[PDB]
Design a protein around this nucleic acid. Sequence first.
RNA 1: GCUGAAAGCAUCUAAGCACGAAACUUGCCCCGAGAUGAGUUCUCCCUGACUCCUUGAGAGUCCUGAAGGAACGUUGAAGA
RNA 2: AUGUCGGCUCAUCACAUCCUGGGGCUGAAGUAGGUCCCAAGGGUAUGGCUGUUCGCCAUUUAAAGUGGUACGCGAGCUGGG
RNA 3: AGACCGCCAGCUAAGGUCCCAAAGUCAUGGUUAAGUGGGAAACGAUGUGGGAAGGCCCAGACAGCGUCGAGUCGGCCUGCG
Lengths: 176, 209, 38, 16, 142
Amino acid sequence: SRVAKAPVVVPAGVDVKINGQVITIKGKNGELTRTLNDAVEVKHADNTLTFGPRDGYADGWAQAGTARALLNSMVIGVTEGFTKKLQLVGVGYRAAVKGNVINLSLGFSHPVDHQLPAGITAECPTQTEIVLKGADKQVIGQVAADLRAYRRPEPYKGKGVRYADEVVRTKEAKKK
Amino acid sequence: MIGLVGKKVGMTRIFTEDGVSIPVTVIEVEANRVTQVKDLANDGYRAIQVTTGAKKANRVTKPEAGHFAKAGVEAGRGLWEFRLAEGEEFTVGQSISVELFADVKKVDVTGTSKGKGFAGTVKRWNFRTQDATHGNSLSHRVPGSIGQNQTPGKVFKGKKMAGQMGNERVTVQSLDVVRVDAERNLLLVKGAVPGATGSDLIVKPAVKA
Amino acid sequence: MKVRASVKKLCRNCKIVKRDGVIRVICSAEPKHKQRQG
Amino acid sequence: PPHRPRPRPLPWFPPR
Amino acid sequence: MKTFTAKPETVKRDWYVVDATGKTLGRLATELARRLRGKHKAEYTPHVDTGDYIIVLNADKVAVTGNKRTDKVYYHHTGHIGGIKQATFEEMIARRPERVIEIAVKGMLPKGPLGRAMFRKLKVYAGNEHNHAAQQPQVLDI
RNA sequence: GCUGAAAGCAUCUAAGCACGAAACUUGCCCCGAGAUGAGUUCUCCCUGACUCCUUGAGAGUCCUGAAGGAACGUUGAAGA
RNA sequence: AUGUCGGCUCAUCACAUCCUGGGGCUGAAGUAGGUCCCAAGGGUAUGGCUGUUCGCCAUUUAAAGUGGUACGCGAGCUGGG
RNA sequence: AGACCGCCAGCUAAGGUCCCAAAGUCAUGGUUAAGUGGGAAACGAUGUGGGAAGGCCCAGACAGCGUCGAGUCGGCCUGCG
Ligand SMILES: [K+]
Ligand SMILES: [K+]
Ligand SMILES: [K+]
Ligand SMILES: [K+]
Ligand SMILES: [K+]
Ligand SMILES: [K+]
Ligand SMILES: [K+]
Ligand SMILES: [Mg+2]
Ligand SMILES: [Mg+2]
Ligand SMILES: [Mg+2]
Ligand SMILES: [Mg+2]
Ligand SMILES: [Mg+2]
Ligand SMILES: [Mg+2]
Ligand SMILES: [Mg+2]
Ligand SMILES: [Mg+2]
Ligand SMILES: [Mg+2]
Ligand SMILES: [Mg+2]
Ligand SMILES: [Mg+2]
Ligand SMILES: [Mg+2]
Ligand SMILES: [Mg+2]
Ligand SMILES: [Mg+2]
Ligand SMILES: [Mg+2]
Ligand SMILES: [Mg+2]
Ligand SMILES: [Zn+2]
């Protein structure tokens, strides 16, 4: 509702394309496309998208609020793009990007090689840092979580793949 | 990948220089001749039909003779089909030799097991015998109880009982290919395979591998 | 995870949430507080 | 406890 | 003067074709069962099959309400001890979509020889094509 | 878990998306078209005359007897 | 007249899981545990004593699960009680 | 609801009217999303409908960070889950 009320601006160099329910947002960074819920009415109007409930649906407002938030992020995706940073804490823990493959070394007896999806690119500022870049906010989120899964931060020394801005609550081993 | 049809010649051993005796079944694999090719358009699946061996012309009925004639191959002792993988291709009339197995490390071998006739539960299902003595009355090798009581008041399907044993299709999987002698039409496989000496064997590259 | 008939907020940070027809308590700070009704 | 005696035989009678 | 009775040798049976696409399974099935039995004809006779032949196309696109698509379970027993098997509506549609309509209709037809005969007049196809042009089926909207 | 509103936040869930076990469906082995919903493919065989009747998927006579099958015999690591 | 304990033979189901599989929390450093959730595919001792079931004991095992089936099973055996 | 017998007539009772299986896929207005309906308790819970008050509120509240701009907060009774 309150999210759905606020219309999202369409900056210059951003081309919308409403095709019933299917939307397509094009820009400099990349191309994104989605299919909205059938209870969402979307209008281009004056170079600013606005959302509201189609009638005959009880969940119209809720569905509009999410549709708004998604399109808002599709806009920022094709312009600025999204960025996630992952630290590797732990002795001997290293990463290495090789095209669209991240070769991890996470204290296993075998090499971890995560194949990246379509519109994601990774970097290695240092050995113990990965920087993901992409248009889709959901996909970059997934990939980051996938990498974190390999070796989640443990609560005694905080060893493992963590997000840059993640508070890892540690605790002491029981006395005696 | 396709297989070949062969004949169980018998068992022997190969001595290795490093002083190991390998027990081998000797499988004679004559040329398998393609009699028919099945395709999706006509048959709905891809396969070859092959024949092997020979047959006296007077034992070949007219329906069978016509089938061999269309292919332009000599009558063999039977027909067997092999499903084709997507890459494979064959033509009617083509011979396939045991050279097929030149690079194959392990095979599955299918045959008809020896026939034991009507077998008891001790032999057929490894049931335990009851006491030989200590008062047992006429119930030394009999199967014991075959069910519960009023619930369920029946015997369940698949209950293990006396019956025909052997004389059925059996596959032994993942046998080592010890030797492939194209010139003698021989395949040596390590270990025993189903059937009596002289029986037909189907040999295929191992599915598990 | 504590599985109980009676699930409750134990602290202020505890949040009740229904997921897939099941009441849960989630607590960022204290994993001990994690509960599922069952 | 047992609710029946162990089976026993009957005396012979002229059968027909 | 006795009440009329249809005669198997003189009864006229027509061919119809129905599109299952987006139809609610149970509400389609009742209409099929009605027509297979011949309850829509004035010559309806309970011991005679007076019904019509019906082709059902696009069985794979039949609809169900609620969470039935994932939660409706089909059970069968193989007859071997422990041999209770099950499949969700979703699994059935993937493996054998025609069975879903056939099962729904069979359960709504009389049990016995006549009901089995009636069911033989239903021809269910997963897709949009059939091979009964020779029977010249008329389109039937259900 | 990701994205994400309802609820300006938060939230794995409502829309959407991703992982996830010897369980489930397959994959392996065997049976299997009486699967009466009785399926498919290949090959082989038969190309006479006449009469009658309540006229039809009718009956009868003569000629013809195929492909193949069965019987019989010698038998089998097949078998009561 | 619906033969009764235990043994033997042959089982079959439940899951409130003994092992193996997956997971959350831990007063979880590791190893090893505790506890709860999911899971029924398969597996799940041999002996001494006693009519025993059980139990105790010896020695194993990944484990020696708990129950239902006329306290499963004598027109299948035994007949110690 | 009390069968004296016959009828290939008609009207009703309880109970019913999508198909099995006779009769509404009847009408109008609500509720439920649980296949609840079609098995059960203490107790638990921002499920959702209705009703009556109250506190705060363009002298700028509640949420997020002095800033931003309209309804919101937490109990009561009650329907269905
Ligand atoms: K057939
Ligand atoms: K048992
Ligand atoms: K199990
Ligand atoms: K009893
Ligand atoms: K008995
Ligand atoms: K006996
Ligand atoms: K129900
Ligand atoms: Mg034999
Ligand atoms: Mg023994
Ligand atoms: Mg005696
Ligand atoms: Mg004896
Ligand atoms: Mg019964
Ligand atoms: Mg009936
Ligand atoms: Mg295993
Ligand atoms: Mg359980
Ligand atoms: Mg399995
Ligand atoms: Mg008993
Ligand atoms: Mg006896
Ligand atoms: Mg008995
Ligand atoms: Mg009336
Ligand atoms: Mg009716
Ligand atoms: Mg209506
Ligand atoms: Mg219910
Ligand atoms: Zn808490």
